[PDB]
Amino acid sequence: NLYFQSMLAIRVVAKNQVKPEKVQEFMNLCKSLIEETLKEEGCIDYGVYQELENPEILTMLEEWKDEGSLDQHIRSDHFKEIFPLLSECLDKETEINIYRKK
Amino acid sequence: LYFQSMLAIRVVAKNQVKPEKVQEFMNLCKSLIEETLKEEGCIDYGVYQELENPEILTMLEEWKDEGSLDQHIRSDHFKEIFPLLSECLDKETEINIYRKK
């Protein structure tokens, strides 16, 4: 049933604020992270997006089959290696929210 | 279309709902979704609840282009329901518009 899936699907919004100097380096790190992550079981969509009038606000938008998939994502090798690098690029701590459809 | 997706515009509308106001909010979202899905340019629209926090209710959306979204926030149902939605909030609703990179 595609309703049941609808109800267990997870979406994360991961909003980053980036150091103007570190943008190119940030982007190169997302490139590898997307390639890897798109190959995982449960990844429905995963992309990085930029707020319109704000070139340095760069958000991660994802959808995962379910909660345990997201759980494998953050326990994965690539996440583990790239997350810390990605974090050196930021003005502030990344602000993350995990949602479900109501 | 991978290409649609590539030009689509996404919005994250974060609302802090008042604990008691939550159910009026949702009945208001019901009609809002209903009319909005009937709109052209609207790929995906839905209200989501934050897992940690049952008061945070966000609108996640995908539009074929800016123009479509301009129409949407000018529609009758948007103009009719949006102000009623804000009756329910603790802050002004926090809106972000995104373009894929």
Tab-separated table of C-alpha atoms in Angstrom:
chain	number	residue	atom	x	y	z
A	1	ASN	CA	0.000	0.000	0.000
A	2	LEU	CA	1.346	3.409	-1.102
A	3	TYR	CA	-0.534	5.209	1.689
A	4	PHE	CA	1.409	3.276	4.329
A	5	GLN	CA	4.679	4.179	2.731
A	6	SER	CA	3.408	7.706	2.492
A	7	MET	CA	2.997	7.710	6.245
A	8	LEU	CA	6.448	6.243	7.193
A	9	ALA	CA	8.587	8.215	4.669
A	10	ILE	CA	10.897	10.675	6.407
A	11	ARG	CA	12.034	14.127	5.115
A	12	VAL	CA	14.909	16.048	6.450
A	13	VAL	CA	15.543	19.717	6.048
A	14	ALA	CA	19.117	20.510	6.814
A	15	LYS	CA	19.775	24.237	6.542
A	16	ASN	CA	23.353	25.450	6.391
A	17	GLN	CA	24.871	28.912	6.591
A	18	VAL	CA	28.136	29.000	4.743
A	19	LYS	CA	31.363	31.073	4.931
A	20	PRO	CA	31.380	32.966	1.521
A	21	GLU	CA	35.009	31.819	1.052
A	22	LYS	CA	34.211	28.142	1.749
A	23	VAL	CA	31.309	27.790	-0.795
A	24	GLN	CA	33.269	26.119	-3.600
A	25	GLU	CA	34.774	23.684	-1.012
A	26	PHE	CA	31.385	23.024	0.525
A	27	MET	CA	29.879	22.249	-2.894
A	28	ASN	CA	32.713	19.875	-3.777
A	29	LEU	CA	32.023	18.017	-0.544
A	30	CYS	CA	28.262	17.707	-1.238
A	31	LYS	CA	29.087	16.349	-4.767
A	32	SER	CA	30.736	13.304	-3.252
A	33	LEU	CA	28.174	12.979	-0.526
A	34	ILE	CA	25.251	12.949	-3.006
A	35	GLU	CA	26.912	10.358	-5.313
A	36	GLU	CA	27.379	8.044	-2.354
A	37	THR	CA	24.105	8.681	-0.584
A	38	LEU	CA	21.866	8.337	-3.621
A	39	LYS	CA	23.206	4.741	-3.846
A	40	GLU	CA	21.896	3.742	-0.379
A	41	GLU	CA	18.825	1.619	0.331
A	42	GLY	CA	15.997	3.982	1.398
A	43	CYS	CA	17.191	7.130	-0.169
A	44	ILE	CA	14.190	8.445	-2.091
A	45	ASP	CA	15.644	11.891	-2.931
A	46	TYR	CA	18.630	13.877	-1.742
A	47	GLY	CA	19.759	17.195	-3.092
A	48	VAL	CA	21.170	20.532	-2.045
A	49	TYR	CA	19.241	23.702	-2.533
A	50	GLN	CA	19.997	27.458	-2.179
A	51	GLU	CA	17.683	30.085	-0.806
A	52	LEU	CA	16.783	32.557	-3.453
A	53	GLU	CA	17.950	35.939	-2.282
A	54	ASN	CA	20.662	34.380	-0.037
A	55	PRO	CA	23.495	32.532	-1.891
A	56	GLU	CA	25.109	31.360	1.347
A	57	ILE	CA	22.064	29.721	2.844
A	58	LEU	CA	22.470	26.195	1.429
A	59	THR	CA	19.878	23.578	2.551
A	60	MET	CA	19.953	19.775	2.303
A	61	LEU	CA	16.591	18.297	1.296
A	62	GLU	CA	16.111	14.607	1.628
A	63	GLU	CA	13.563	11.874	1.703
A	64	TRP	CA	14.081	8.516	3.209
A	65	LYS	CA	11.869	5.378	3.027
A	66	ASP	CA	11.702	5.367	6.822
A	67	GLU	CA	13.400	6.278	10.039
A	68	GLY	CA	15.805	3.291	10.171
A	69	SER	CA	17.104	4.200	6.737
A	70	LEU	CA	18.023	7.713	7.967
A	71	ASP	CA	19.581	5.953	10.887
A	72	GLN	CA	21.830	3.952	8.516
A	73	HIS	CA	22.605	7.121	6.578
A	74	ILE	CA	24.138	8.943	9.580
A	75	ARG	CA	25.961	5.733	10.664
A	76	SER	CA	27.403	5.336	7.127
A	77	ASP	CA	31.109	5.642	6.186
A	78	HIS	CA	30.689	8.547	3.745
A	79	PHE	CA	28.493	10.472	6.099
A	80	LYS	CA	30.981	9.758	8.876
A	81	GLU	CA	33.942	11.039	6.748
A	82	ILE	CA	32.318	14.038	5.038
A	83	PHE	CA	30.138	15.430	7.711
A	84	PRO	CA	33.021	16.682	9.694
A	85	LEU	CA	34.622	18.358	6.647
A	86	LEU	CA	31.365	19.932	5.610
A	87	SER	CA	31.133	21.391	9.111
A	88	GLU	CA	34.447	23.281	8.855
A	89	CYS	CA	32.710	25.373	6.125
A	90	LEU	CA	29.952	26.827	8.251
A	91	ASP	CA	29.316	30.144	9.951
A	92	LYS	CA	26.866	28.439	12.360
A	93	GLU	CA	25.901	24.856	13.492
A	94	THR	CA	23.723	23.279	10.806
A	95	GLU	CA	19.980	23.536	11.753
A	96	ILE	CA	18.223	20.155	11.023
A	97	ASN	CA	14.540	19.121	11.301
A	98	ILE	CA	13.155	15.662	10.688
A	99	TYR	CA	9.563	15.453	9.525
A	100	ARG	CA	6.751	13.051	8.701
A	101	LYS	CA	3.631	13.672	6.722
A	102	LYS	CA	0.560	14.626	8.673
B	1	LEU	CA	11.469	15.008	-15.676
B	2	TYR	CA	14.787	15.142	-14.044
B	3	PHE	CA	14.554	18.499	-15.752
B	4	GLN	CA	11.354	19.506	-14.037
B	5	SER	CA	13.042	18.604	-10.772
B	6	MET	CA	16.010	20.630	-11.742
B	7	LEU	CA	14.074	23.858	-12.201
B	8	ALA	CA	11.453	23.254	-9.568
B	9	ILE	CA	11.274	25.618	-6.710
B	10	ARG	CA	10.842	24.353	-3.149
B	11	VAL	CA	9.444	26.001	-0.055
B	12	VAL	CA	9.733	25.187	3.566
B	13	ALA	CA	7.074	26.917	5.562
B	14	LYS	CA	7.817	26.344	9.249
B	15	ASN	CA	4.942	27.068	11.738
B	16	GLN	CA	5.076	27.040	15.569
B	17	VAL	CA	1.454	26.184	16.323
B	18	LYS	CA	-0.194	27.034	19.696
B	19	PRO	CA	-0.696	23.762	21.470
B	20	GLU	CA	-4.569	24.259	21.681
B	21	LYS	CA	-4.869	25.789	18.228
B	22	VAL	CA	-3.388	22.664	16.492
B	23	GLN	CA	-6.708	21.054	15.378
B	24	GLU	CA	-8.208	24.287	13.813
B	25	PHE	CA	-4.896	24.566	11.988
B	26	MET	CA	-5.160	21.140	10.545
B	27	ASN	CA	-8.796	21.571	9.347
B	28	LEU	CA	-7.640	24.735	7.722
B	29	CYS	CA	-4.716	22.883	6.094
B	30	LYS	CA	-7.139	20.208	4.786
B	31	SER	CA	-8.948	22.732	2.440
B	32	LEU	CA	-5.764	24.505	1.645
B	33	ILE	CA	-4.095	21.303	0.398
B	34	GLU	CA	-7.270	20.389	-1.423
B	35	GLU	CA	-7.477	23.535	-3.482
B	36	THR	CA	-3.703	23.870	-3.970
B	37	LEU	CA	-3.242	20.388	-5.456
B	38	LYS	CA	-5.805	21.323	-8.178
B	39	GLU	CA	-3.378	24.258	-9.129
B	40	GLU	CA	-1.163	24.045	-12.187
B	41	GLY	CA	2.584	24.165	-11.467
B	42	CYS	CA	2.181	22.439	-8.179
B	43	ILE	CA	4.173	19.274	-8.123
B	44	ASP	CA	3.989	18.438	-4.448
B	45	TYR	CA	2.322	20.023	-1.406
B	46	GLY	CA	1.800	18.714	2.110
B	47	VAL	CA	2.035	19.522	5.802
B	48	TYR	CA	4.571	17.781	7.927
B	49	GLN	CA	5.094	17.426	11.660
B	50	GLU	CA	8.508	17.538	13.245
B	51	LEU	CA	9.459	14.266	14.865
B	52	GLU	CA	10.961	15.637	18.049
B	53	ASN	CA	8.289	18.483	18.381
B	54	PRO	CA	4.536	18.012	17.794
B	55	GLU	CA	3.952	21.794	17.751
B	56	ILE	CA	6.200	22.455	14.701
B	57	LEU	CA	4.060	21.985	11.514
B	58	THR	CA	5.773	22.694	8.214
B	59	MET	CA	4.586	23.066	4.725
B	60	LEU	CA	6.833	21.322	2.220
B	61	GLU	CA	6.274	22.229	-1.382
B	62	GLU	CA	7.460	21.910	-4.980
B	63	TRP	CA	6.436	24.279	-7.812
B	64	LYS	CA	7.390	24.098	-11.526
B	65	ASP	CA	8.664	27.764	-11.375
B	66	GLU	CA	8.597	31.130	-9.568
B	67	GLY	CA	5.620	32.380	-11.552
B	68	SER	CA	3.553	29.388	-10.396
B	69	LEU	CA	4.361	30.146	-6.810
B	70	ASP	CA	3.478	33.824	-7.323
B	71	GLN	CA	0.050	32.738	-8.588
B	72	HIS	CA	-0.387	30.388	-5.624
B	73	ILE	CA	0.262	33.021	-2.988
B	74	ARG	CA	-2.227	35.228	-4.802
B	75	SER	CA	-5.011	32.619	-5.216
B	76	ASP	CA	-8.386	33.052	-3.436
B	77	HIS	CA	-7.916	30.094	-1.105
B	78	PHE	CA	-4.452	31.254	-0.175
B	79	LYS	CA	-5.731	34.775	0.508
B	80	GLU	CA	-8.688	33.302	2.426
B	81	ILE	CA	-6.900	30.760	4.638
B	82	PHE	CA	-3.423	32.069	5.142
B	83	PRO	CA	-4.553	34.801	7.587
B	84	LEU	CA	-6.744	32.252	9.460
B	85	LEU	CA	-3.692	29.990	9.770
B	86	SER	CA	-1.700	32.742	11.442
B	87	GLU	CA	-4.446	32.965	14.129
B	88	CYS	CA	-2.943	29.687	15.369
B	89	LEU	CA	0.742	30.567	15.602
B	90	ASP	CA	3.198	31.668	18.313
B	91	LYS	CA	5.489	33.421	15.831
B	92	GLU	CA	5.299	34.698	12.251
B	93	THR	CA	5.656	31.599	10.068
B	94	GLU	CA	9.212	31.103	8.821
B	95	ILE	CA	9.344	30.730	4.984
B	96	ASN	CA	12.230	29.671	2.733
B	97	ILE	CA	12.278	29.438	-0.987
B	98	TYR	CA	14.834	27.230	-2.587
B	99	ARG	CA	16.278	26.583	-5.991
B	100	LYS	CA	18.086	23.333	-6.663
B	101	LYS	CA	21.854	23.364	-7.038
